[PDB]
């Protein structure tokens, strides 16, 4: 993985010494070649995970997420120099450095072999995101955002650390391959119940589960766009990925304690969706939609069914792409209006036809229009849940319904109407954002064409 | 402003007879019943007591609302019809035409030139019209929703540009 | 109640402004000036085959429209998808599957040559 790690690390000196004008160009292009190199990592052996070294390995679950992060890295670079144009060169270089360190930590996380190293980099993603959210944020509760986000993450992270070190003392090693091959049945002891809770609740905090999901409507809504997309697209996937890794040594106990959280998500995905309907801000609506989709992924994880795992992975990838695109579109409109209430600027479909389209298939993919990978990922989870329990369907059946409502509602109330007369700053569509939504959208349908890649390790 | 009794009965007659048109459908029925209702209205104009006249209006509105058409006719372009707000998807704000690329501008050259002179009208008229609305503002806050005139010569009447440059009835 | 001269002065002032703006909305003889464009010689030949005004020439202009339509829209599909079917799709098992045709008594099968044996007499009912 050092064919991807070493270039990512060496990307830091390039930006840190590039001229006052070349930082954006150089970072964008070289991150694009980094994504190209990581495109190779989609090469997967039939059943054996690709073990590059002792400390680094990859399989059909880590590789798609890694490719997602590496391909994403140019996208924040393209979305940031709009709101980062009027800044000192050193400050811009550090913003870029925060982004590269974030991507590097995500790569080491996804390619980590020992659970402790996975925890180290997984949590270590907090710091660059914290700096991005706090310093470069524009709204008020950004300072409150950082506190909420850090403390919510850590409150689950530390018990996970205690559980992992206890596992190391008892089992012998935290290596994934060992704990899977040398896996042993888990007894229904209450100490084992608390161990399962410690191993689960950190990822479920970052999932998020309903109830303890307040860090997203107070974090993604406030972060700069680059931070917002890197949060929603991948950082949410950290908990799902960790759960998929950890349920190997968390059975057969899970089912007995699967009952509270599963429905907590199942019911929660309704409320969040309902919360999406009666929203006032675009970014908050997208954040709550992300919460609902991630709750569906939670249900997929706790079913522990092959089909559930494949649908889960597909939903993570598709949701990352769709949420990043929706946040980018919201930023474009907000910057054009310097406000975020989704009533101030409506009826812009005529003014910006390409934005009107980009919003149209962004909503369609968010609404999971078949045969997009969003729809197949959702439907696989629906079928797995129905096999696990029939009634789930109606709740599932409710979700996209309400989702569809808001999935079109903002499009009705932001572009499908009459323009506001007193505003005039809406200029011609700068081709930067249009191109950015292109690099968002075309890979989505490309993966729709061949979903065997994002299908996960169960395929 | 305030709804005087004559206004409240003019609206009553309008609503009642348009609903009668929706009811009787055919034009000869509408003519007969409309003349009959015109008589039924003008027969008792001489209600001296304003309270009694308003009570008769109570009865008239009550019975009309009980018998108003369950599907009154509304013309399309008018509020409620099929062509209502159907042309909004075509009208574009005028200030967008300051955004056209120099190629787009030169491909429609003389219209941009006349927009330039209209813009000059707007600039030279803004200060004149703001001081005009200032001098004849109701002292200490505007009183009525009315709009102040261009009493002097050549001054563009205050608050004119958006009405003048309003998107046409048929932008297309 | 009410078209007062105070409000009149506004109304026909706005009238003459609005009208002159609408005269401005009217385009001009040079409008719309169109930037110069290259034209391929084949459509020069085709518009010269359209200028003469003859009936047969107009008819064959539109039938050549239909002919290029046929070759580039309804002939290249039967090219490519037949190439795909008979040599790629049909070459693999069960990709193309057809029900056995309804073989009635007294019918000859091509391969076997046998005529399916006839059935006993019909009840010879008549209305």
């Amino acid at each position: 993985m050092l064919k991807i790690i070493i270039p990512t690390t060496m990307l830091l000196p390039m930006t840190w010494m590039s001229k006052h004008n070349m930082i954006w160009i150089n970072a964008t292009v070289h991150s694009l070649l980094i994504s190209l190199i990581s495109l190779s990592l989609l090469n997967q052996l039939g059943e054996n995970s690709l073990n590059f070294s002792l400390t680094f390995f990859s399989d059909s679950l880590s590789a798609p997420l890694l490719v997602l992060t590496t391909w994403l890295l140019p996208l924040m670079l393209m979305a940031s120099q709009s709101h980062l144009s009027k800044e000192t060169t050193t400050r811009k270089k550090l913003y870029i450095t925060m982004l590269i360190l974030l991507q590097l930590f995500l790569i080491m996380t996804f390619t980590a072999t020992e659970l402790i190293l996975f925890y180290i980099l997984f949590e270590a993603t907090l710091v660059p995101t914290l700096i991005i959210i706090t310093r470069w944020g524009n709204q008020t509760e950004r300072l409150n955002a950082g506190l909420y986000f850090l403390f919510y993450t850590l409150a689950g992270s530390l018990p996970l650390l205690v559980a992992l070190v206890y596992i190391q003392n008892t089992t012998g090693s935290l290596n994934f391959l060992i704990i899977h091959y040398w896996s042993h049945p888990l007894s229904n002891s209450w100490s084992n119940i608390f161990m399962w809770l410690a191993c689960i609740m950190a990822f479920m905090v970052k999932m998020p589960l309903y109830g303890l999901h307040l860090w997203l409507p107070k974090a993604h809504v406030e972060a700069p766009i680059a931070g917002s997309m890197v949060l929603a697209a991948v950082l949410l996937k950290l908990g799902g990925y960790g759960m998929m890794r950890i349920t190997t040594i968390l059975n057969p106990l899970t089912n007995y304690m699967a009952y509270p959280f599963l429905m907590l998500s199942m019911w929660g995905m309704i409320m969040t969706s309902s919360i999406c309907l009666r929203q006032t801000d675009l970014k908050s609506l997208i954040a709550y939609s992300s919460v609902s989709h991630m709750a569906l992924v939670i249900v997929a994880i706790m079913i522990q069914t092959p089909w559930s795992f494949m649908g889960a992975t597909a939903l993570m990838i598709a949701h990352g792409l769709t949420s990043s695109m929706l946040f980018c579109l919201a930023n474009t409109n907000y910057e054009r209006v310097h406000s975020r209430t989704m009533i101030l600027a409506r009826g812009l479909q005529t003014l910006l036809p390409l934005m009107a389209t980009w919003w149209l298939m962004a909503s369609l993919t968010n609404l999971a229009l078949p045969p997009s990978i969003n729809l197949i990922g959702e439907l696989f989870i629906i079928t797995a849940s129905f096999s696990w329990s029939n009634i789930t369907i109606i709740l599932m059946g409710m979700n996209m319904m309400i989702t569809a409502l808001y999935s079109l509602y903002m499009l009705i109330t932001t572009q499908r109407g009459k323009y506001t007369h007193h505003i005039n700053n809406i200029k011609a569509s700068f081709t930067r954002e249009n191109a950015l939504m292109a690099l968002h959208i075309l890979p989505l349908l490309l993966l729709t064409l061949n979903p065997k890649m994002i299908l996960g390790p169960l395929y | 402003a305030y709804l005087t009794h004559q206004q409240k009965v003019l609206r009553l007659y309008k609503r009642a007879l348009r609903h009668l048109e929706s009811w009787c459908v055919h034009r000869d029925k509408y003519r007969y019943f409309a003349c009959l209702m015109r008589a039924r209205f003008d027969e008792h104009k001489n209600e001296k007591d304003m309270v009694k006249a308003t009570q008769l209006l109570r009865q008239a509105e009550e019975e009309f609302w009980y018998g108003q058409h369950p599907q009154p006719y509304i013309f399309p372009e008018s509020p409620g019809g099929t062509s209502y707000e159907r042309y909004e998807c075509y009208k574009v704000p005028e200030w967008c035409l300051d955004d056209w690329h120099p190629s787009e501008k030169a491909m429609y050259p003389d219209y941009f030139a006349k927009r330039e002179q209209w813009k000059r009208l707007r600039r030279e008229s803004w200060e004149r019209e703001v001081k005009q609305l200032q001098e004849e503002t109701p002292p200490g806050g505007p009183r009525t929703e009315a709009l102040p005139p261009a009493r002097k010569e050549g001054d563009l009447p205050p608050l004119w540009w958006h009405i003048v440059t309003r998107p046409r009835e048929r932008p297309m | 109640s009410g078209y007062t001269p105070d409000e009149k002065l506004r109304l026909q002032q706005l009238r003459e402004l609005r009208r002159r703006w609408l005269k401005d909305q009217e385009l001009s003889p040079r409008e719309p000036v169109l930037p110069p464009r290259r034209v391929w010689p084949m459509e020069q030949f085709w518009n010269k085959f359209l200028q003469d005004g003859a009936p047969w020439k107009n008819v064959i202009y539109k039938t050549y429209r239909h002919s290029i339509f046929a070759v580039t829209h309804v002939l290249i599909p039967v090219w490519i998808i037949h190439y795909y079917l008979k040599y790629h799709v049909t070459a693999k098992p069960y990709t193309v599957v057809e029900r056995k045709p309804r073989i009635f008594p007294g019918d000859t099968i091509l391969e076997t040559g046998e005529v399916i044996p006839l059935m006993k007499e019909f009840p010879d009912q008549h209305h």
Binding site: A428 | V92, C96, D99, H101, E104, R168 | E26, L27
Partner: peptide, 12 residues
């Protein structure tokens, strides 16, 4: 008689 067409700038 053809009136003016007020459209967003489609060049970009």
């Amino acid at each position: 008689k053809r009136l003016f067409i007020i459209k967003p700038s489609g060049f970009y």
